[PDB]
Write a protein that binds this ligand. Structure first.
Ligand SMILES: *[C@@H]1O[C@H](CO)[C@@H](O[C@@H]2O[C@H](CO)[C@@H](O[C@@H]3O[C@H](CO[C@H]4O[C@H](CO[C@H]5O[C@H](CO)[C@@H](O)[C@H](O)[C@@H]5O)[C@@H](O)[C@H](O[C@H]5O[C@H](CO)[C@@H](O)[C@H](O)[C@@H]5O)[C@@H]4O)[C@@H](O)[C@H](O[C@H]4O[C@H](CO)[C@@H](O)[C@H](O)[C@@H]4O)[C@@H]3O)[C@H](O)[C@H]2NC(C)=O)[C@H](O)[C@H]1NC(C)=O
Ligand SMILES: *[C@@H]1O[C@H](CO)[C@@H](O[C@@H]2O[C@H](CO)[C@@H](O[C@@H]3O[C@H](CO[C@H]4O[C@H](CO)[C@@H](O)[C@H](O)[C@@H]4O)[C@@H](O)[C@H](O[C@H]4O[C@H](CO)[C@@H](O)[C@H](O)[C@@H]4O)[C@@H]3O)[C@H](O)[C@H]2NC(C)=O)[C@H](O)[C@H]1NC(C)=O
Ligand code: HEM
Ligand SMILES: CCCCCCCCCCCC
Ligand SMILES: [Mg+2]
Length: 335
């Protein structure tokens, strides 16, 4: 009949490095029904049992897992998790798929809401990923070896055979160029414009072993292990400090870029969007997403309305800190 959703966990008591690839969290292969998706972080956490191994979890479980497994910073975890949950999760059962649709999220919500998981393209997941192809080409969730080959190439060319901040700057730009030239539906605005810069530094800040204090750089063996196999490196120790998107500013600065997309269903036709969120206009992302939620839930009434109000508030608590102050919106009023 429904669940009453708890407020998000706070930061972990212990915030130092530790062994995360340990006896209680062994890698195991997929069973029938297990779900995986476009996030190598959540994928690895599920395949090591930090999340439920079936790849369906509550917001709270996702937050505690990203913190325990990788030392993802609390506010960043809140901002990402409730974004994903509002758009792609089931607010009544409080379950989110980290991939595509599954009966495991429970009785479906009223359309146009879907609870179709992080695979759903267009508002959250989008284009110019590092190891995933654009949705226009048919698969936005599976690892793509050709794209990983380019990851390797750019690491060879700019990072001495390792992935570092310099490589991220170059790879991010080049992937944008690839999508401009080949994808007539290419979008790079709003949520995607913000997430696309952070995602390129997560491998440096979170996938590099926490015992490495200087000259942080990711080997291709470790990259492959996480991005392709959903497996922590042997003896992997998480970041020694809570972390997220440190260095994303520098990635943008290496090749300044403006939100927009290919217009009129044609390649090599990128038009700027001046209304999109960007890095000096972050609250636009908040307002946009709240708009998107209204489109999904145009007139909720019961347990659903209640859980929407709570999840929206939860998200705001993170957004407010992360974005440096945003006026909370109340599209369904108060409880
Ligand atoms: C991601 O990973 C990559 C890959 O590892 C990593 O890249 C390193 O980046 C750092 C800097 O960002 C590099 O180190 C710097 O290299 C600068 C460029 O060096 C060239 O030019 C030097 C300057 O030459 C002067 O004199 C000659 C006359 O001899 C003249 O022609 C020139 O015009 C100029 O006036 C030159 O010395 C250097 O050649 C030396 O070194 C090579 C070895 O690379 C050797 O083979 C040569 O024989 C020679 O000894 C080269 O051609 C350099 O200018 C810069 O120096 C500054 O800093 C040092 C100390 O930090 C000071 O001593 C000095 O005052 C300078 O101000 C510095 O050394 C490094 O080489 C990169 N490594 C690689 C492999 O590319 C990224 O940093 C990583 N990213 C992140 C974010 O971590
Ligand atoms: C793994 O991921 C890769 C990368 O995303 C996928 O490969 C891409 O597949 C698409 C679809 O076939 C390719 O798109 C086509 O590209 C043509 C241009 O490509 C050349 O130029 C680029 C560099 O600019 C080179 O990298 C590339 O090797 C080529 O030499 C376009 O001309 C095509 O356009 C036509 O169709 C569109 C859509 O209908 C129209 O809008 C156009 O007007 C035109 O008629 C087209 O966009 C793309 O090039 C591929 N990239 C690479 C590097 O391979 C894999 O399919 C994916 N596969 C899996 C599952 O592993
Ligand atoms: C906390 C909740 C999280 C959510 C909801 C989430 C969601 C997502 C989604 C939807 C994508 C795909 C983006 C796209 O294609 O546009 C993605 C990509 C990514 N995520 Fe996560 N993520 C989370 C946490 C993490 C953590 C903790 C890490 C690292 C440890 C991480 C690393 C990545 C990376 C590297 C990518 C890019 C993959 C690629 O482009 O090849 N994420 N995430
Ligand atoms: C892969 C997870 C994406 C991170 C969360 C989306 C919003 C970005 C917040 C950081 C602002 C600089
Ligand atoms: Mg993508």
């Amino acid at each position: 009949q429904g669940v009453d959703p708890p407020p998000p966990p706070g930061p972990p008591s212990f915030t130092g490095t530790k062994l995360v690839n340990d006896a209680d969290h062994p890698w195991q292969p997929l069973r029938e029904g297990d779900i995986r998706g476009p996030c190598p972080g959540l994928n690895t956490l599920a395949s090591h049992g930090y999340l439920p191994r079936d790849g369906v979890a509550t917001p709270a479980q996702i937050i505690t897992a990203t913190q325990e497994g990788f030392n993802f910073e609390n506010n960043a975890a809140i901002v990402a998790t409730y974004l994903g949950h509002l758009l792609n999760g089931n607010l009544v059962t409080d379950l989110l798929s980290i991939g595509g649709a599954t009966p495991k999220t429970g009785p479906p919500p009223p359309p146009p809401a879907h609870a179709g998981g992080l695979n759903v393209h267009g508002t959250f997941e989008g284009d110019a990923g590092m190891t995933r192809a654009d949705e226009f080409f048919g698969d936005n969730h599976s690892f793509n070896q050709t794209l990983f080959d380019k990851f390797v190439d750019f690491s060879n060319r700019y990072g001495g055979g390792f992935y570092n901040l310099t490589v991220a700057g170059e790879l991010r730009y080049s992937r944008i160029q690839d999508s401009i030239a080949t994808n007539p539906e290419f979008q790079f605005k709003n949520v995607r414009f913000i997430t696309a810069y952070g995602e390129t530094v997560f491998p440096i800040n979170l996938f590099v072993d926490g015992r490495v204090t200087t000259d942080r750089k990711l080997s291709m063996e470790d990259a492959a292990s996480i991005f392709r196999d959903m497996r922590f490196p042997d003896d992997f120790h998480r970041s020694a400090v809570p972390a997220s998107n440190e260095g994303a500013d520098q990635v943008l600065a290496a090749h300044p870029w403006v939100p927009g997309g290919n217009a009129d269903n044609q390649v090599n036709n990128y038009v700027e969007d001046p209304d999109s969120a960007d890095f000096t206009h972050l609250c636009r992302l908040y307002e946009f997403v709240v708009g998107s939620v209204q489109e999904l839930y145009p007139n909720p009434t019961g347990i659903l309305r209640r859980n929407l109000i709570k999840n929206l508030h939860y998200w705001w608590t993170g957004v407010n800190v992360a974005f440096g102050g945003c006026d909370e919106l109340f599209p369904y009023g108060q409880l």
